């Protein structure tokens, strides 16, 4: 009965934390993508022109 809540708590603490941090990290991946992308597409299209 003790170990049950020990495991449940440890699991849910881990899983929630993982979700939260990955969620935050995503936005940064978005903004880095945006900045890479707009140049990459512009200058490649430009060359072929």
């Amino acid at each position: 009965k003790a170990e049950k809540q020990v495991t449940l708590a440890l699991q849910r603490q881990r899983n929630l934390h993982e979700d939260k941090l990955s969620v935050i990290e995503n936005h940064l991946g978005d903004l880095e993508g945006r900045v890479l992308a707009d140049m990459f597409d512009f200058l490649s299209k430009e060359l072929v022109r």
Binding site: T7, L8, L10, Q11, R14, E18, S22, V23, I24, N26, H27, L28, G29, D30, L31, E32, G33, R34, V35, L36, A37, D38, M39, F40, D41, L43, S44, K45, E46, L47, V48
Partner: protein, 1145 residues
């Protein structure tokens, strides 16, 4: 490490380590105008890039400043790579300087106070590395003295003029013995023992624990003619011990090892039973002469670095004591690394089922000789090489080419041909035969040679490529030097070697293959690339330059280049064993091939059929089995693992941990020192429900039975197809059978594999009325496509074929109660009615499972098994020595995640990370790492490598599906939930024109589902996985605003191609790292600004995208990312004909 004190009294401690390119920036900052008087108009890049060695010394604080570069020829043009030996002997006839024993310096700098110490330490390091380097030559224009620094080490010697001018150069010399002695050898005395005794006890207790403390002394006393003991001495004291014995139990060696090359271990004898009259593998050469090899049988040595050269010198004295003996043997027990002494030895090859407790090594009296020399082909060589090659397979070809080049000055076509012989004591034993490459661009497009060259400093003129190279193996230890001299003499930087798939043509070893003798040891394997699919019809001129575009007879690339030609590349003798490959296992073998730091020697693969991908199939055979698209025939050819991987055929049949042994059935034994289990999941027999349609029960009753195993006899007309070999077996049997013409056949199992089989059989040509197809209801109601529109399309195609489709059913008994083999008629239960069907043949894809046989073999092991095999989240089984991965594996319940498993992820990412973990046990160059914290034991860490399934489908559609790892969930449930995703979808599945993506509300892409009658560029589309809609050219607007006509055509446009390009992902890593950099005193990073704005740490009236984009475009970071991109375009433009930077104009 060594301690140095500045004249200021400041103290530093320093290490020497072999240069890494980041060092170059620092070292170049050291360079001085004074140094430019010594070596001016050096730009380091060129000299390093041609270097024979780069050596750096550095302090505990990672302040880097001590460096020198050395090469096999002088600076200042005082002589040539062509030759220098006579001119230097004309300086001093007594100096034995030759490429055997000579190197020149070409640069140094250090911060002066530490510098003077560092120069000494670097010199000591070099002489410690390269034992024949008895001297370093240092040369300056005569107007310069060396001055204090170098005067502390180098002494002056007769001058050389400029080869051209009335400009003289002065010559100065440093002596190895001054900065690293030889040994002295004398035959042991009792007093000598006491010095050595602590050394042995430092190494090991065990011998003393048997013998008692004075064993070494008693051994010293023991000596006679049959056993001599000898030591090296320094400081008037011993610190090395070597034992030899005359006895060698020849019957053992004659059984265990193929002495074909090594007849000499016996005397000649006129019967010479050296040949037979697979039995050749059973045959053993019956030597009838006498034992003229001797063994070494005890060795320890250490100041420790003194061992490195001095061990070799022992061999010279040892041979002196055996006038009758010419070979030295040593047997080496497993796990023991090759310390220096053994490395000179040839590693003997054990026979085709030898198993010994040891590996065996050879060295020969001639090795002591030093007249080994290279010269380029002339006439007399013909006789010597004829004597030499007489056993060589292509002995005729090699001879004929040597004779040709002696006439022609050319190869038959006319291109460069170069042929080299090794001359020894006025005798020959070496041959090399090498050709000059020109498809270097093809190489560079196919393989990452760039890992080991900065190609742009090299030139298309500079490349050699090997074809034939054969030797007295004894010389092979020197041979690494032989490659150095070859490269010098040919004026080439690189040697290349192509390994050609050993299946070859269906019979022919096509002449693109080469007859490779020993060289493969010294080369490196080069990681294989991935070309983008090019829409050449949309490009015309703007193609990847057509040579690169070509296909060619696909093969593996191996290489050496001068800077490598010193690296000992320390072998690993550990018997590391990997079990199975299905779905996954190959990935582990790849990483262990593809790390040049190491050289695996005992690694062995055990598999039902050994290697993957043997067969020259034709694609219809591939149609049978749904694929993960992560490997193909050409991939297997490139990976070429057989080149180093040792292979056994048939699966394994028992574990036995206590021996650390594994059984292949019929008591054929393999031994492991690490055991990695990776069978994948495999199909198991579709067990009949037993309870029948003829018995009309309620379906849940039958459902419980349906879980059970089958244990009856196997129908000769029932098929289980795990593998291409199974598919070929079945297909040949079908072609040799009537059924294809006429029969009625069941494929059973609702998995994609069924639909792929159905399409395959329709391709073979069975009438769709022939085909019957039954798909039982699931334990969880996710279809094997989770796309009802495409599923409906397939089902309508099945209708047009007339395939016989049955939901809900469960397998009542084929042949009911009558004898089951062959099947002829079958029953199926349902929620309402009986079914009967006519079944000429039955195909299973019912459930994948661990194999019963191997499951039992595991349970015998008493490795923890919970219906699937139990591991921690760092692959440890209940045995510290046994580890497991892939969908056959599962975590402890404590992880509370029995839904989440290795089954969920990519295969490759699993194998890659598993190998990375296991390397940490093997690799000395990274530090050895602790066992996991329990804190890791808390969790399964989120991998991301997308999982691929892809298929051809009834009515000749192509299909491809890619996923983020997840617990299944129905499409419509996720779509009706708002809290998930925006989707992007251009499609009509029945019309054969279909994409679906899902994007996540984090606006990344994390799904693919595509359905097709077009050969999709899956390699390109796989890169679409995980991409932001921005990266896909603000794709979301393109989907919204009626802008995209369809996805397939739109990806043709050139900008996407970089997104496909592999380096671009690492460039994205660079670009993130640039944003991680902090550019100005006042400013957070762009990342920290975003973090604040997104976390409500700042709050806004505009939405965060607007604020962030404005602040970025206002900021200077944009220029830095733009510049970085342009630079990458420069490098990649070689690969890519469509990226603008200064360089286009």
């Amino acid at each position: 490490m060594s301690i140095l004190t500045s004249p200021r009294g400041k103290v530093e401690v320093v290490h020497c380590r072999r240069t890494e390119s980041q060092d170059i920036f620092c070292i170049k900052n050291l360079v001085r105008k004074f140094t430019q008087k010594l070596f001016g108009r050096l730009n380091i890049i060129y000299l390093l890039e041609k270097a024979n060695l780069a050596v750096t010394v550095c302090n505990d604080k990672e302040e880097i400043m001590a460096h020198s570069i050395f090469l096999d020829y002088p600076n200042w043009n005082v002589a040539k790579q062509d030759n220098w030996i006579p001119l230097f002997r004309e300086l001093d006839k007594e100096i034995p300087c030759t490429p055997l024993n000579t190197l020149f310096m070409h640069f140094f700098v250090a911060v002066d106070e530490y510098a003077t110490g560092c120069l000494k330490e670097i010199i000591r390091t070099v002489f410690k590395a390269v034992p024949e380097l008895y001297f370093i030559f240092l040369i300056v224009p005569t107007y310069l003295s060396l001055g204090s620094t170098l005067i502390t080490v180098f002494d002056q010697v007769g001058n050389i003029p400029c080869l051209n001018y009335n400009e003289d150069f002065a010559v100065h010399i440093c002596h190895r013995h001054n900065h690293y002695p030889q040994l002295h050898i004398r035959k042991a005395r009792v007093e000598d023992h006491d010095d050595l005794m602590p050394i042995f006890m430092h190494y090991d207790n065990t011998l003393k624990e048997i013998y008692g403390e004075y064993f070494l002394a008693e051994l010293i006393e023991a000596q006679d003619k049959d056993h001599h003991a000898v030591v090296c001495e320094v400081e008037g004291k011993a610190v090395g011990f070597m034992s030899v014995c005359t006895s060698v139990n020849l019957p053992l060696l004659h059984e265990c090892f193929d002495l074909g090359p090594f007849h000499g271990f016996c005397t000649p004898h006129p019967d010479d039973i050296l040949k037979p009259s697979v039995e050749s593998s059973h045959f053993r050469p019956l030597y009838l002469g006498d034992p003229i090899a001797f063994c070494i049988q005890l060795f320890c040595i250490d100041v420790l670095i003194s061992n490195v050269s001095l061990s070799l010198d022992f061999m010279s004295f040892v041979f002196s004591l055996f006038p009758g003996k010419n070979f030295c043997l040593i047997s080496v027990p497993h796990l023991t690394p090759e310390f220096v002494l053994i490395q000179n030895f040839v590693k003997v090859v054990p026979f085709n089922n030898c198993t010994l407790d040891h590996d065996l090594y050879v060295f020969h009296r001639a090795g002591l000789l030093r007249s080994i020399t290279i010269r380029l082909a002339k006439f007399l060589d013909t006789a010597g090489v004829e004597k030499l090659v007489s056993t060589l397979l292509l002995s005729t070809k090699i001879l004929d080419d040597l004779a040709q080049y002696n006439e022609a000055g050319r190869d038959p076509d006319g291109t460069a041909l170069q042929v080299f012989v090794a001359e020894v004591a006025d005798q020959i034993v070496g041959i090399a035969v090498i050709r000059k490459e020109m498809d270097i661009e093809y190489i560079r497009s196919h393989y990452n040679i760039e890992d080991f060259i900065y190609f742009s400093h090299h030139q298309q003129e500079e490349h050699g490529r090997l074809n034939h190279f054969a030797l007295n193996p004894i010389f092979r230890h020197y041979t690494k030097f032989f490659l150095k001299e070859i490269l010098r003499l040919g004026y080439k930087s690189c040697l290349y070697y192509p390994v050609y798939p050993q299946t070859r043509e269906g019979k022919l070893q096509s002449s693109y293959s080469h007859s490779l003798t020993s060289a493969l040891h010294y080369l490196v394997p080069v990681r294989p690339r991935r070309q983008i699919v090019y829409p050449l019809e949309k490009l015309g001129i703007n193609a990847p330059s057509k040579e690169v575009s070509k296909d060619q007879v696909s093969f593996a690339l191996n290489h050496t280049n001068r800077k490598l030609t010193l690296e000992p590349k320390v072998t690993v003798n550990a018997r590391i064993v990997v079990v199975g490959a299905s779905s996954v296992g190959i990935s582990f073998l790849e990483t262990l091939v593809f790390c040049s730091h190491l050289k695996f020697n005992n690694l062995t693969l055990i598999s039902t059929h050994g290697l993957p991908g043997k067969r020259l199939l034709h694609n219809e055979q591939r149609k049978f089995l749904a694929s993960d698209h992560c490997f193909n025939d050409k991939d297997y050819a490139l990976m070429s693992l057989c080149s180093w991987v040792n292979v056994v055929v048939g699966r394994m049949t028992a574990i036995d941990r206590a021996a650390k042994q594994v059984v292949v059935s019929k008591s054929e034994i393999v031994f492991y020192d690490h055991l990695i289990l990776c069978t994948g999941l495999q199909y198991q027999v579709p067990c009949p429900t037993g309870a029948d349609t003829e018995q009309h029960l309620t379906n849940r009753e039958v459902l419980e039975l349906s879980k059970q195993r089958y244990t009856g006899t196997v129908p000769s007309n029932l098929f289980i197809l795990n593998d291409e070999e199974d598919c070929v077996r079945m297909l040949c049997w079908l072609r040799n059978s009537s059924i294809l013409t006429e029969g009625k056949v069941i494929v059973y199992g609702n998995t994609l594999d069924a639909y792929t089989t159905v399409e395959t059989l329709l391709n073979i040509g069975m009438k769709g009325s022939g085909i019957y197809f039954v798909h039982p209801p699931t334990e969880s109601n996710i279809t094997c496509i989770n796309n009802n529109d495409v599923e409906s399309a397939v089902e309508d195609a099945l209708s047009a074929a007339g395939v016989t489709v049955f939901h809900d059913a469960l397998l009542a008994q084929w042949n009911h109660g009558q004898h089951p083999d062959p099947i002829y008629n079958a029953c199926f239960t349902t929620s309402t009615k009986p079914i009967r069907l006519e079944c000429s043949a039955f195909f299973s894809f019912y459930k994948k499972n661990v194999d019963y046989e191997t499951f039992k073999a595991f349970n015998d092991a008493c490795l923890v098994y919970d219906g699937r095999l139990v591991i921690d989240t760092t692959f440890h089984t209940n045995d510290i020595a046994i580890r497991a991965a892939g969908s056959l594996t599962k975590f402890s319940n404590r992880y509370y995640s029995n839904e989440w498993t290795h089954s969920n992820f990519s295969s490759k990412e699993i194998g890659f990370q598993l190998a990375a973990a296991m390397l940490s046990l093997f690799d000395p160059t990274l530090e050895p790492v602790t066992e996991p914290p329990a804190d890791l034991d808390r969790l399964i860490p989120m991998y991301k490598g997308a999982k691929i399934q892809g298929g051809i489908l009834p009515g000749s559609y192509h299909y491809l599906h890619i996923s983020k790892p997840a617990i299944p969930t129905p499409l419509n449930l996720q779509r009706s939930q708002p809290d998930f995703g925006s989707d992007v979808v251009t499609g009509n599945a029945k019309k054969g024109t279909y994409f679906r993506l899902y994007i996540n509300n984090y606006k990344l892409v994390e799904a693919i589902t595509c359905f097709s009658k077009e050969p999709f560029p899956s390699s390109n589309y796989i890169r679409l996985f995980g991409q932001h809609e921005q990266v896909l050219n603000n794709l979301c607007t393109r989907f919204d605003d009626k802008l995209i006509p369809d996805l397939y055509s739109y990806f043709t446009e050139p900008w996407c191609m970089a997104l496909f390009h592999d380096r671009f992902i690492d460039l994205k890593k660079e670009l993130r790292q640039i944003l991680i950099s902090k550019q100005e005193e006042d400013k957070p990073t762009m990342e920290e600004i975003a973090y604040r704005l997104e976390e409500e740490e700042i709050n806004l009236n505009e939405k965060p995208q607007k604020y962030l984009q404005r602040v970025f475009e206002d900021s200077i970071y944009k220029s830095l990312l733009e510049k970085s991109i342009l630079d990458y375009l420069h490098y990649n433009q070689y690969h890519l004909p469509m990226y603008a930077w200064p360089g286009i104009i």
